[PDB]
Each structure stands twice: as C-alpha cells, then as structure tokens.
C-alpha cells in the first residue's frame, strides 16, 4: 500500500478523555481504574475518595479507538484491543507498551480473560479468535519475538463480544450471526451453537465453572444459558433498547445491565420480577465495571459515549424512581471536536467541540491560535471568509475527538503559497513540503548543519504517525524523538520515497501551470497558478504605467491587480474550460 504521514494537534498532556470510554478495568490491589478511551489513550485513575486529582498516567500508543482492555497477572500486565487492528501488551505498573500483536485483519473488539490459566483471547471484525498465554507474551524480548498462534474457527460473521470462564475451559463468542458459538480453549474444538437471539450480541458473561452463560443483545433481551443442556433457560426483557453492557456478582445471581436506553438495572436471575433501577445515565452505556471489594458490590463504574466516567453506589439494592440521582464519584472528561472547517487559505481551521466552544487552529504550525468561546460557528466562517484559493493539501479526521492531519502523496505538495501571502517574511513556499520538514526536523538524515525548514516549528510533543492508506500503522513517534537510535533506524524503513525526496534529498516539488487565453474585449498563454493579475496586465502593456492604463476582465467582471490567476479560475470563472481573460484600456 501507499504510506501516509499523519500527526495529531494536541497538548503534551491530555489529562482527560477527549471522547467516549469503551472499556473499564478495576485494580483492587492498588485501587486503580483503567479507562479504554475512544480517543486512543488508556488512562489510569486513583479511585481513592481522598484524591481530588485522580489522574495518574496516560498510556498513549494506539492510533484509533481502544475497544477492550483486560488486567491480568495480578495487575502487572494490561492487554488492549483497538480499532487500529492491533492487540498490545502493556506494563500496567509503569504504563508503557511492551509489544504489539498484528495477527488481526480488522477492528479488534473483544478481549476474554481466564484468571486461573492466565489465558487471554482476542476477537474482532475479521471473524478470527486468537488465543494467547500472557506469560509467553510478557516473556518476549528483542531476540525472542516469536509466538505460536492457536486460533479458534467456525464463526461466519464479525465478533462483537467474547467471554471465558475463570478456569479457562469454556470460551463463548458473540457476533452479528445472532448465535453464540462455544469452544474449548484447551483443545480448540467446537462445543455447541447456542441460538435464540435475534440481533447482534455485545455482552457475554460466564460463571466460575463455565456451566452458565449470560448474554445481552441489541434486541434488548438478556438470556441465561445452560451449557450442560445447551439451551436458553431464562430470558429477561428489562430494557427498551439494545443491551450493551453486562455485569454479574461473584454468586452469579444478580445481573447488572445497561445499554442505549441510558438506564441501568439490577435484576435477580432467580426471579426477574425483582428489578431495581440503579440510575439513568446522560449517554448510552458502553461498558460497566463492578466494584468487587465487598459482597454485595458497593458500587459500579459506568463508561458511556461521553468523556465523563461516573461511579454509582449500590447501597440499598437488596434492602420508576432511580436508586441514585447523582454519581458518588466523578472522573472529569474533556471536549470532543465534532465540527471542522478548513479556511480558504488552507492553513487555518475553525473547530467546534461538544461544549460548543469554537477554536482557531494553525495547521502549518500545528498549534491552536485562539479560543473564540461560544460564538456561532457558521457566522465565524463568514466573518473569516477570504477571496483566495489554495489547493487542498491535507485531510482532517476527528475519529479520536482530536485534530489529526493526514498527508498523502497525491496532494501533499499541491499548495504553492508565496511567503508574503503567508505569515513568513517574497520567495515561493510549498506548505506540504515545509510541514514535512518540520515534522521530521529531529531526524538526523534530514541534516545537511541546519535543522528543519527554517520558517516555523511544530511543537516537539507532536505525535507523528506513519501508516498505510486505509491500512495499518507502520510506525508512531513524537516529533522530538526522531533523533534516537531506535527511532532513526525505524524511520529509515518506514518513511516512503515521496517523503525522502523532499525532507532528505531536498528536491523541489512540481509547479502547477494553468494555461489561459488573452483576447481583446469588445494567443494562449501558460503561467504559474500563483501569477498575479498585474503580471498579465504588464504583458499586455508591452504588447501594445501598465497598472493605470490596462484593466483586465473575466466573465464581464473587473479583476483585482493583486488577485492571482488561481483565485480567478476558482471563484470568478465559473466555467469548465480554459480560463479566458479580456483586456481593455482604462
């Protein structure tokens, strides 16, 4: 595939989630909560009530949604699954990624964990389920980097949920097949095909011995299964909309469910009549984590599509008006950029976030210019309109709730802008070429010593990402880390030729040429797109002081002397043929 260069405009420290939270993991030994955010960052929080600032660390190595996390090996290792098609092993005590598993071909959505055998299974949208032993994964080194793979098979559609029992002898998969497939992880042999759900299944649970299974589905029903009898022994319909999260107690008698309806219920498995409305969240519930320090669980941690994570007490369930009205403990969350507009200069962007705040950003410098508060977003676009045209040279994606700018070979070097037109004090400048040199400024291979493009500098903490177009992430690093021995060796293998040409060879990109017709108003000419109308004015003057005597026209409209041909072709011309200009004496 073709390699793309992308980077994120952000702060050095993103303390709070900038998007929803997909998964939760609670560490009872250290009293730590892990949140797998949709902003591609895993964060560690102290659940101690005393701490006014629960933030501990950010585990930032993924490049897309983090879908599932499992805390294994007595809280020393964290396994994470993500939409960037990778499974990653983390050091949960220090907070750094140890290794990356690239066996999956699509989004990885589920992680199953067996505590006794330290066995972890990863399933995703590629219909594959891989089995992993954590001890083998954690023992990997630079020389020992090979692992034997045992993959379950038989599932004909994309998996959305996965579960294993405590003893590591039963594994259940939920998918859009609307059926539950059960294997034995030890022998990798198919056991049974549970049927009865009429929609996608996103939640799965099993008891300690793996004889009963709880499943919640998008059809809005919770089904209790018996693996011995291979049948659905009970069905619970307590939700108006699809059930997305399930939690059960150690006795496997009460199930906690939440979904798109934003309501969380505690239902007794022995009798579905006993139902308790725990709370009513402000967003659809994506995942829940039970506090298992005491039996019954004192509280439950709830992750929603919002950036805020709330803890709801469960004191009085066993002792509709909701049991709780305000969460006991609240983890703060940030704002997600939801709207984006690239201005006419192809250098500044107006963004609007979930807090309705509008901000002004500089793509070239990869920084924010100013906060505009809650000003109308459409009005601010009109108040900043300029009659200039620059070709597109970058793309913006907001999948992580942050500004990620992608550079592609097709149009990275399409924008030639004069220094005077930009803020740099006129020689011609290529915006894409200047940005690439600033991104790879610390790379020793780009030194011939001067560093960078010599005009501006992106913030050192800028995450630079190299990945295949519509593919996988080849290499991710910060801007300031290019000088290291490991990064430089990795950069030599990942950086494509079209970036080497400009950042290393220091070659200059092509100059786009726009031919046009000069005819007398009542001889085809080809010129640079950046050429001003004055240059065409003086050429006619020599053909027949030039500014005063000659006025150029297009579509029976006057042309500004300082306006360039590229702008004229885009706005005034409004035609699909070669730009025609008409000259007449003033």
């Amino acid at each position: 595939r073709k390699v793309q260069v992308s980077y994120v405009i952000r702060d050095e420290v993103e303390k709070y989630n900038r998007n929803g939270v997909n998964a939760l993991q609670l560490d009872p030994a250290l009293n730590r909560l892990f949140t797998a955010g949709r902003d591609s960052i895993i964060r560690i929080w102290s659940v101690n009530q005393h701490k006014q600032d629960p933030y501990i660390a950010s585990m930032e190595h993924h490049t897309d949604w983090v879908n599932d996390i499992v805390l294994c090996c007595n809280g020393k290792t964290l396994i994470s699954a993500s939409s960037d098609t990778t499974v990653k092993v983390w050091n949960a005590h220090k907070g750094f990624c140890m290794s990356t598993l690239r066996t999956h071909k699509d989004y990885v959505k589920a992680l199953a964990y067996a505590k006794d055998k330290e066995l972890v299974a990863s399933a995703g949208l590629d219909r594959q389920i891989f089995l992993w032993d954590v001890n083998t994964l954690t023992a990997l080194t630079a020389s020992n980097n090979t692992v034997t793979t045992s993959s379950l098979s038989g599932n004909k559609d994309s998996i959305y949920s996965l579960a294993m029992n405590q003893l590591g002898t039963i594994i259940v998969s939920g998918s859009t097949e609307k059926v539950l497939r059960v294997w034995d992880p030890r022998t990798c042999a198919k056991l049974m095909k549970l049927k009865g759900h009429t929609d996608n299944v996103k939640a799965l649970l099993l008891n300690r011995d793996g004889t009963q299974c709880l499943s919640g589905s998008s059809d809005g029903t919770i089904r209790l299964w018996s693996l011995g009898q291979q049948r659905c022994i009970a069905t619970y319909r307590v939700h108006d909309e699809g059930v997305w999260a399930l939690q059960v107690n150690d006795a496997f008698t009460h199930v906690y469910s939440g979904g798109r309806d934003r309501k969380i219920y505690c239902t007794d498995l022995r009798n579905p009549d006993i139902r308790v409305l725990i709370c009513e969240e402000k967003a659809p519930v994506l995942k829940m984590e039970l506090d298992r320090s005491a039996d019954p669980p004192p509280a439950i941690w709830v992750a929603t599509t919002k950036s805020t994570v709330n803890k709801w007490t469960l004191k009085g369930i066993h002792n509709i008006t909701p049991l709780c009205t305000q969460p006991d403990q609240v983890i703060k969350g940030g704002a997600s950029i939801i709207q984006c507009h690239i201005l006419n200069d192809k250098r500044h962007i107006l963004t609007k976030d979930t807090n309705n705040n509008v901000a002004y950003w500089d793509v070239l410098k990869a920084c924010k210019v100013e906060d505009l508060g809650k000003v109308d977003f459409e009005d601010e676009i009109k108040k900043r309109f300029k009659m200039v045209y620059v070709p597109n040279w970058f793309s913006v994606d907001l999948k992580t709730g942050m500004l990620t700018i992608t550079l592609d070979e097709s149009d990275c070097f399409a924008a030639w802008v004069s220094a005077k037109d930009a803020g740099f004090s006129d020689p011609k400048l290529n915006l894409g070429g200047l940005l690439l040199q600033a991104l790879l400024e610390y790379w020793p291979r780009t030194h011939v010593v001067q560093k960078g493009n010599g005009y501006f500098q992106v913030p050192p903490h800028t995450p630079v990402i190299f990945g295949e177009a519509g593919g996988r992430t080849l290499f991710r690093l910060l801007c300031r880390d290019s000088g290291g021995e490991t990064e430089s060796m990795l950069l030599n293998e990942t950086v494509p030729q079209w970036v080497i040409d400009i950042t290393v060879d220091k070659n200059m990109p092509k100059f786009n040429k726009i031919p046009f017709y000069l005819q007398p108003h009542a001889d085809r000419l080809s010129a640079s797109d950046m050429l001003q109308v004055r240059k065409v004015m003086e050429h006619v003057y020599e053909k027949i002081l030039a500014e005063e005597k000659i006025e150029l026209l297009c579509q029976d409209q006057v042309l500004d002397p300082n306006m360039d041909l590229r702008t004229v072709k885009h706005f005034i011309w409004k035609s699909g043929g070669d730009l025609t200009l008409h000259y007449r004496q003033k």
């Binding site: 690239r102 090979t146 692992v147 290291g484």
Partner: protein
Amino acid sequence: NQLDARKSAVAGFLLLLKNFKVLGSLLSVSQVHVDVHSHYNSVANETFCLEIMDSLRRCLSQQADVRLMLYEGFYDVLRRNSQLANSVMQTLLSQLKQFYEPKPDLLPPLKLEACILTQKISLQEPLDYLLCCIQHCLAWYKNTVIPFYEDLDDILESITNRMIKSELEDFELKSADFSQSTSIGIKNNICAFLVMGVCEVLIEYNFSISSFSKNRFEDILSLFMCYKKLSDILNEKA
C-alpha cells in the same frame, strides 16, 4: 561444512563490520513475529559485534586466501568500530606469536618454515601481510584511541634489530635452489617473498617511530639492502 562458502561468509561479515557500527535486529506455520517495543541496547550490540569477531578469529586457521582477506579487512573494521579495537589486537598478536621467535638472540626473528604447508609445497600464512596489518592497526591505535600496544612496539623493535643483524643465511636462502619446478626451489621462492615483504613493512614502521632520527634511518637502509640483495638474487636467476 562446505568450503568456498565460508569464504563468502568471511567477506560478508568483513564488509558488514567495516561499514556499520550498529548490527543486529531491534518461522513455522503458526509462528508469527511480535513487534516488541524494546529500546536499542548498546551493550547488546557490542556483544553481538564481539561474537562476530570471535567467529572471524576462528577463520585465521583456514586457507591463506581467507587469512589474506582478514588482514586486509581488520584495519577497516578497527577504524569503524573502536570498541572492537581490543579484539583485533589480541587476535593479531596471538597470530604473530605463532611465528615470532621471542628468544632475544636466536635468528631468524620469524619461523618462516611455520608459514609453509606441504602436502606440493604452498603458502599457508602470509606473514608479511600479517605484519602489514599489525603495523597499520597499531599506528592507528597509538594516534587515535589513546587520546599490548606497549608490547607490540617491543616486538616490532625486536624484529627490526634481529632482521638487520640476520646474515641472510638464517632464512635458508645466496642461491640454494630458487627453481620453479623443484619442491625446495618453490619453497625458497615463496619464502623469498615473505622476507622481502617483512622488510618493506618494517621500513614503513621505522620511518614514523622516533620521528626523523638518524639511527632508525640507518636501520631502514640496512633493511632495504636486505630486501634489495634478495631481490637481486631472485631476479638474476629468473
């Protein structure tokens, strides 16, 4: 085990070790590689490079062609990798000990018969090329890494003085056979090249050491006469 393929391996390591200061990385049906995010270790690289040099040291016992590449390559390797400088000198000094007579009064200074393989008489050790590599590597050592070496000058000084006072008979060489067909004639011709090559190397050595001192230059002329006289006898017969 097959020969003529270890020669290419020696060439591969030599070219790869004289050009790159950093070497080394950062399967079955169901075996996959895992991207371990481990930082580059200098200590691991040094051990990796040292192990390769230890594998090259074991090749100094092969054919004279393989020894020739290593002598030509060790100078480039020692200039690229300064951490392997100590490995080269110990490897080079040990090889010299196999042919250097450490007795301060026995002549000749070198066992020219130990460099010859008889089975057809051929050359087993290019002793003159070994001394050339030692002299150049030592000269680079004493002018680059300082800001065994104190013993290498002592040996080279010892070879210098004893070669001059050698009567040109201790090499078993005015004209014994010097033929191109007889076994003893071929051995003498091969041994004639080694002693002339040694004289050239020591002429280069005594020029730089002690700077422009008279005594060393008198030793160069006497060393040259040793080379010139044996050059004349081989030229007139052939």
